[PDB]
Amino acid sequence: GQKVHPNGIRLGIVKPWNSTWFANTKEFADNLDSDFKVRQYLTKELAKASVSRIVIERPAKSIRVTIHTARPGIVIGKKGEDVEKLRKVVADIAGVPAQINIAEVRKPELDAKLVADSITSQLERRVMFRRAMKRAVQNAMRLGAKGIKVEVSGRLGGAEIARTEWYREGRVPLHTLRADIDYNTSEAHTTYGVIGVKVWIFKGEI
């Protein structure tokens, strides 16, 4: 309706870049080209593996793929499953002879995609949102997370012209810039209707 993306205004503010490489003019369009074919591809295997973010910097003809996760025991595989296999991709189709860096951020029900994609995993399970929202709001209210704002998109229950949702809770001061909001929309492909989700999480003043 009438908004700005709460990351896009705050990358110039204390919320940092979730990818930051550098180059010059001619290769300036071919580098984030390579950075896109890994970010569409790391979703394709690390989907159930509790994916959080993907960070890419270019120190010298290499990318430091700094994967942030919360369930790393399934990410590693058979202790060597995903060391060179996920450096095999970046060598040619990204053109980057690079290394891999997996790392866990804890609290696996508090990151933006995690609160988002769990409800999708509960709506791919097709449980009642009226039982799903009311608990998955308070998972954030359990482990801290000073404020939440969760809108579930329509085509919910039996309807073809549906409504929106809210559960506003705590405090979500996104109109004030100094509020480091871990926001990430997701999408859940229930058969009738694209049931989407918008998740605002406030991780403390700075």
Partner RNA sequence: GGCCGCAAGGUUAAAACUCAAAUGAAUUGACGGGGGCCCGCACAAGCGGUGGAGCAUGUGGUUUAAUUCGAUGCAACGCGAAGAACCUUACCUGGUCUUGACAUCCACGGAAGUUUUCAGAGAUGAGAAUGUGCCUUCGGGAACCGUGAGACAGGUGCUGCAUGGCUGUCGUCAGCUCGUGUUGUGAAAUGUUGGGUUAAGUCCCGCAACGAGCGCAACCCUUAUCCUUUGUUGCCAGCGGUCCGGCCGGGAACUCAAAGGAGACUGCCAGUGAUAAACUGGAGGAAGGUGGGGAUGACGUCAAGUCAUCAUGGCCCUUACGACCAGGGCUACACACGUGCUACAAUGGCGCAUACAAAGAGAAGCGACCUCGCGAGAGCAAGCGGACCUCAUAAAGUGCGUCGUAGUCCGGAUUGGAGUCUGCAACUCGACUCCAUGAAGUCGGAAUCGCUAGUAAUCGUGGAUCAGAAUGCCACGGUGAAUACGUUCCCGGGCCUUGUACA
Under the binding rule (CB under 8 A), the answer on residue 33 touching other proteins is yes
Write the binding mask 24 to 63 for RNA: x where contact by CB under 7 A, - elsewhere: -xx-------------------------------------
Interface pick for other proteins out of 34, 35, 49, 199 (rule CB under 8 A): 35
For residue 72, the Cα-to-chain-centroid distance in whole angstroms is 16
Query: Which of 109, 87, 98 shows the shortest CA–CA distance to 42?
Result: 87
Using N-to-C axis directions, what is the helix angle for 129-142 and 112-124, rounded to 10°?
Answer: 150
At 128 the three-state DSSP class reads coil
In angstroms, what is the minimal distance from the CB of 117 to other proteins? 16
Interface pick for other proteins out of 19, 66, 121, 138 (rule CB under 8 A): 19
Name, in order, each residue with C-beta under 8 angstroms of 121's C-beta and a sequence gap of 6 or more: none
Q: Which does 22 bind (CB under 5 to 8 A by kind): RNA, other proteins, none?
A: other proteins
At 99 the three-state DSSP class reads strand
Q: Which does 17 bind (CB under 5 to 8 A by kind): RNA, other proteins, none?
A: other proteins
